[PDB]
Design a protein around this ligand. Structure first.
Ligand SMILES: CCCCCCCCCCC(CCCCCCCCCC)(CO[C@H]1O[C@@H](CO)[C@H](O[C@@H]2O[C@@H](CO)[C@H](O)[C@@H](O)[C@@H]2O)[C@@H](O)[C@@H]1O)CO[C@H]1O[C@@H](CO)[C@H](O[C@@H]2O[C@@H](CO)[C@H](O)[C@@H](O)[C@@H]2O)[C@@H](O)[C@H]1O
Ligand SMILES: CCCCCCCCCCC(CCCCCCCCCC)(CO[C@H]1O[C@@H](CO)[C@H](O[C@@H]2O[C@@H](CO)[C@H](O)[C@@H](O)[C@@H]2O)[C@@H](O)[C@@H]1O)CO[C@H]1O[C@@H](CO)[C@H](O[C@@H]2O[C@@H](CO)[C@H](O)[C@@H](O)[C@@H]2O)[C@@H](O)[C@H]1O
Ligand SMILES: CCCCCCCCCCC(CCCCCCCCCC)(CO[C@H]1O[C@@H](CO)[C@H](O[C@@H]2O[C@@H](CO)[C@H](O)[C@@H](O)[C@@H]2O)[C@@H](O)[C@@H]1O)CO[C@H]1O[C@@H](CO)[C@H](O[C@@H]2O[C@@H](CO)[C@H](O)[C@@H](O)[C@@H]2O)[C@@H](O)[C@H]1O
Ligand SMILES: CCCCCCCCCCC(CCCCCCCCCC)(CO[C@H]1O[C@@H](CO)[C@H](O[C@@H]2O[C@@H](CO)[C@H](O)[C@@H](O)[C@@H]2O)[C@@H](O)[C@@H]1O)CO[C@H]1O[C@@H](CO)[C@H](O[C@@H]2O[C@@H](CO)[C@H](O)[C@@H](O)[C@@H]2O)[C@@H](O)[C@H]1O
Ligand SMILES: CCCCCCCCCCC(CCCCCCCCCC)(CO[C@H]1O[C@@H](CO)[C@H](O[C@@H]2O[C@@H](CO)[C@H](O)[C@@H](O)[C@@H]2O)[C@@H](O)[C@@H]1O)CO[C@H]1O[C@@H](CO)[C@H](O[C@@H]2O[C@@H](CO)[C@H](O)[C@@H](O)[C@@H]2O)[C@@H](O)[C@H]1O
Ligand SMILES: CCCCCCCCCCC(CCCCCCCCCC)(CO[C@H]1O[C@@H](CO)[C@H](O[C@@H]2O[C@@H](CO)[C@H](O)[C@@H](O)[C@@H]2O)[C@@H](O)[C@@H]1O)CO[C@H]1O[C@@H](CO)[C@H](O[C@@H]2O[C@@H](CO)[C@H](O)[C@@H](O)[C@@H]2O)[C@@H](O)[C@H]1O
Lengths: 201, 201, 201, 201, 201, 201
């Protein structure tokens, strides 16, 4: 109902600044729409785009497995669903609070909702920071055009060629930047609540 | 209606702790979204990724059938729909209880809803535990890179090679962990209701 | 409207037991979700999985047509839409009954709704039983690994090989069991209404 | 709104029998669901299932074009959207009648709705009958297994083979039967309104 | 809301005849459903259905580009979205008129809605007429079975063959007829408002 | 709720002209529908439509990467989601303004909504203008039919041929025109608010 949805939206964002109320939800929606609309077109065919110059049985599959143990499409899907877990717990906690206080009326509980809001921002700051570090460790900042392989069952060292290294590099840097701004604005919303006044005190 | 949906949500979760009210529904939704979004991309092409070094008619199909009698994608779909059966029976039982007590007013029946809640948690604990044991028995904890085959109509013993063993191993361990936490938090919600006070008494 | 939907649900299930109110709708939904999610992955490629050892023009297509005149995917889709026809007629009959008695108020007609409920269960019992018998007659209980063919325009007798006979056998036995329980619980709901007191009297 | 939708459903079916109120809408929905769920799987690959024994340039395409100038999938889609045109005109005429009589109150116009109901049944009887005759003229009652071709630019007479003639024949006879019952029950609903008392008088 | 949607539908069609209120919206919906359901199946594979008898590098692509600079699927999508632009402007103009006159009450503005209705019909008449003329200029009334090509980098003159010319011709004539009736009934709705009394006066 | 949605639409467009209220939203919706319906059919297969006359390993992929570092489909998706970011921030700012002034009543804040409306139009003018300049710099106004390549690991200079250059050129000019009108009508809506009276004063 409108009267109910209108009271729920005012309670979920009563102790937030505009950074947490407007800017963060739009940035996270931007990231998801970009991944769903453009992701499969850039990285979906990476296996048939990895051509090695050989005919020995089993050497091609051994070299591709050593180059990419995990696809970026699978990495990014895990990041967006894990980062959504603290927000879904907080929104469910807020819904049951509004239900079990409507029948009563329709302080001690207002201070419980603030501690839950600080806890999910802190968890999102830790999860977002670990993901950026893993992305740099797994993929770097560029996709090369060739790759040298000396994995068994290959005889000697073989050269393999990759397709579309420019478009894949452009998409990798864009995702780093979009996630980097999500981390900065999560950190800033904790400062405007008083993270500074807690550290040195 | 809001007034009706608001009374239904307060009745379905009146004798639950936060583990059953918030944590379990989010974990089960996480598992389903991960399977639908990433499952086909990891395991969808497993048949054409199984290359055997032979030309005898019918030996390739006999070796693949001996390696995997059932695909993990089919196994995991069965697990999530079977585990949802006790919850759908409980939510339907609760809906008809609220309907046939609204026209009256709008004790003996409050104690019937508690026994139904304990029964579906116990059934989910048994179904979830059997699935984890079968997953380990069928697949183990890793996917190998080669496989030796001596099944008829093959002459001698042939070697077959598999593609992407690292990404398939990573996904198999992730699904074991997500299901393992679902089992732990189902067991804990039965303890907080008084499973301990029933066993030794 | 809630007040209207709430009166409709209480009328459609006023003379039903819990077997007809909870258990049957969940079993029928389980069957449909399993067919839509897993069916195409097991049986969708059966035509290119039927390899015959020959080069004569037209012999391959003649042997596949003699092996499977109808695919199980087409058989099962027909079964689930035919079994839904009696239930859709009953739910429409109930909706117009509630509409043409709201404007009046908002016995003779309560006894018309009971006879319509008994008639659609009896029709579903006949349709479900005929489908199980046809499934056994068309497919049996297992899918073989080879098949011998002496159909024109083949010269002599040729051997053809099939892929994935284990996974196809597992899925065929699962669908027989799910449909078998639907038949048992339709028969039991007619007994709890008084089928026994009508036969010998 | 419920109060509005409830008055609209009682006006659209105030001068109908149960044949027009329950049986016809379910039969037409059955036909559409069967076409969308099973149609592409039976007839979607008919072009690559038409193998001719030749290498002359352009003879294969000339023989397939002489065999099927129109696919059954395209024929059946046209039939279901054309038959829905009289019903959509009638339901729109009824909606504006209820709107322009609510503000007034909320005879001469009740007799206008009856003449519109008789006119759309008569149009559907003519369109449904013409479609059945064209289906028999274009396709017959069976799909053959071979086809002889003497069309230019073929040198001589060549034989072409078709795949899956049994499953295509089964689906063609099923669609004839489903449409045949739609025609019978449209004709019967005009008789129960008084078509008999108009012909001989 | 029903009370709001009910007042909006009576204002958008208060100065229309049944041609503009019922017949035109059904014809335009018919065209869109036919294009989405059957279009890709007839014209989606036109590039691989254009076989030329040559091996020179680049001659095949030069001949197909000279035959079809624009696909009918792209032409028809542009026609239906362009023709919908005047109707979307009119329906938005009507919505804001009803909103900014509800708070007041809930003549000079009734005459503004009539001039806007005449302007969008006139724009649709011009856009629909230009599309029919371009369709005849680009495609004609039939698709041939062969095509002769003397475009560079081809050496000499080569013959190319097309697949399914009968089904493509049938679909092209059907789309001309459906659009031709849309133009006639747009012209007739302007005459019934008084286009005749404006021309000679 | 209707009463709430009706007050929200009147506040979001209380200081707009018809250019911003009707014309701009329809033009932006037109662009998105054209990209989703026709984009993949024109540019989806550009990689297999780039045929080079060579057999050296790795020369084909090096030449395609030098021709197109970024696909137009990826460029246009980024443009439409970036241009939607200022509008989503403004509509969220307006929703919370209406909520936190309903409970009060149900000047200083009316002047805050005007400054936010001017700021998102100015941001959209800068983003739209930069996109048009980049589109001309990356792609020009036409797609050629051939391309000469002297990139390593190619030996000498090779010629590569492209398919369908006419249809790709037609679509590129259409997207430039649709975006050009979006820029003009964003600039005009700032002039009708008083951009002229601010520049020289
Ligand atoms: C109004 C005036 C405005 C002026 C604007 C100036 C701005 C310049 C833009 C630069 C940019 C923007 C990308 C779009 C990002 C959008 C973000 C949204 C993304 C959506 C999610 C594209 O710009 C390129 O466009 C080319 C078009 O062909 C132009 O080519 C010239 O002109 C043509 C004319 O037609 C001629 O035809 C053509 O012959 C000319 O060569 C160049 O100007 C330019 O390189 C990116 O530059 C790119 O350069 C390449 C070069 O190597 C980089 O490759 C790297 O090195 C390779 C070898 O080591 C590796 O192999 C590769 O792996 C690696 O990557 C890329 O990485 C990237 O840095
Ligand atoms: C800010 C500092 C932070 C530091 C972080 C340290 C953490 C280290 C992470 C480790 C991890 C995380 C996977 C992501 C899980 C995400 C969960 C979400 C999943 C979404 C659902 C990927 O890390 C790998 O990344 C490689 C990238 O190429 C790196 O390669 C090096 O550096 C490159 C540099 O570029 C160079 O290019 C490259 O030459 C270097 O070799 C290595 O560092 C590392 O192996 C998993 O390790 C993996 O190792 C492989 C090795 O064998 C395992 O293979 C197993 O053995 C094979 C042979 O028996 C079998 O054949 C295979 O079948 C079997 O499996 C895998 O099983 C797995 O254990
Ligand atoms: C915690 C302890 C718990 C212990 C649990 C014990 C329970 C045992 C389960 C048994 C079951 C469950 C299927 C899942 C059903 C789920 C229902 C949901 C379905 C979703 C809709 C799979 O179990 C199999 O798993 C194998 C895994 O490879 C194991 O192989 C071994 O260990 C591996 C180790 O890794 C080694 O690698 C491997 O070398 C070992 O060989 C075996 O243990 C076993 O055969 C079905 O058994 C199956 O057996 C095969 C054999 O022939 C049947 O084939 C039939 O005969 C062929 C020749 O005539 C025909 O050609 C074929 O056509 C026909 O069919 C199948 O029909 C089916 O009966
Ligand atoms: C509880 C007891 C209950 C007893 C029930 C008795 C009822 C019998 C049913 C009969 C029916 C039902 C189809 C399902 C319709 C469902 C409607 C819903 C459809 C969903 C939209 C399938 O039944 C077939 O099933 C076979 C299974 O293989 C059986 O084969 C035997 O047993 C196997 C055992 O395993 C053995 O393996 C196998 O070796 C045995 O040969 C046969 O019994 C039978 O032919 C249709 O019969 C079909 O026959 C074929 C023969 O030619 C017709 O082909 C026609 O002629 C060809 C040559 O001119 C042309 O080339 C072809 O073009 C043309 O068509 C078909 O047209 C059709 O008439
Ligand atoms: C109850 C009695 C009722 C009697 C009804 C009489 C009505 C006759 C209908 C006629 C119609 C309706 C199409 C359906 C339109 C539906 C609209 C909805 C569309 C959905 C969006 C199909 O009718 C055809 O059906 C054939 C079936 O095979 C019949 O073939 C015979 O009988 C078979 C028996 O089985 C035998 O097997 C078979 O050997 C016999 O040859 C013929 O009767 C007839 O040609 C269209 O006719 C078509 O003719 C072809 C001939 O050339 C035209 O080709 C043109 O010329 C080529 C060479 O220059 C070019 O190459 C081609 O490019 C060009 O096009 C087509 O253009 C079109 O005009
Ligand atoms: C009622 C009277 C009304 C009269 C109307 C007059 C208007 C004329 C329209 C002109 C237009 C409209 C495109 C539709 C735009 C719709 C916008 C919506 C788009 C949806 C998003 C299509 O018109 C073409 O149609 C041809 C049909 O085949 C006609 O061909 C003749 O007649 C046939 C008869 O059948 C005969 O068969 C056929 O043999 C005849 O040759 C010609 O008339 C004409 O070229 C575009 O013209 C196009 O010309 C080509 C030529 O080169 C241009 O190619 C360029 O050069 C190449 C070589 O350098 C490059 O290789 C290429 O890369 C480059 O591009 C294109 O770029 C484009 O400019």
């Amino acid at each position: 109902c409108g009267r109910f949805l209108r009271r729920l939206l005012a309670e979920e964002s009563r102790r937030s600044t505009p950074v947490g109320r407007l800017l963060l939800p739009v940035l996270l929606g931007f990231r998801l729409v970009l991944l769903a609309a453009s992701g499969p077109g850039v990285y979906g065919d990476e296996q048939s785009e990895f051509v090695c110059h050989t005919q020995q049985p089993g050497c091609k599959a051994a070299c591709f497995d050593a180059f990419h143990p995990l696809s970026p499409l699978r990495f990014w899907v895990f990041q967006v669903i894990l980062v959504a877990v603290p927000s879904a717990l907080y929104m469910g906690f807020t819904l049951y609070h509004v239900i079990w206080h409507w029948e009563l009326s329709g302080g001690a509980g207002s201070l419980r909702l603030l501690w839950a809001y600080v806890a999910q921002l802190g968890a999102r700051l830790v999860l977002e920071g670990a993901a950026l570090g893993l992305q740099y460790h797994l993929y770097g900042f560029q996709m090369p055009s060739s790759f040298a392989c000396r994995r068994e069952p290959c005889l000697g060292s073989i050269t393999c060629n990759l397709s579309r290294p420019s478009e894949k590099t452009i998409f990798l840097k864009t995702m780093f930047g979009v996630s980097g701004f999500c981390l900065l604005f999560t950190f800033l919303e904790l400062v405007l609540l008083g993270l500074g006044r807690w550290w040195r005190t």
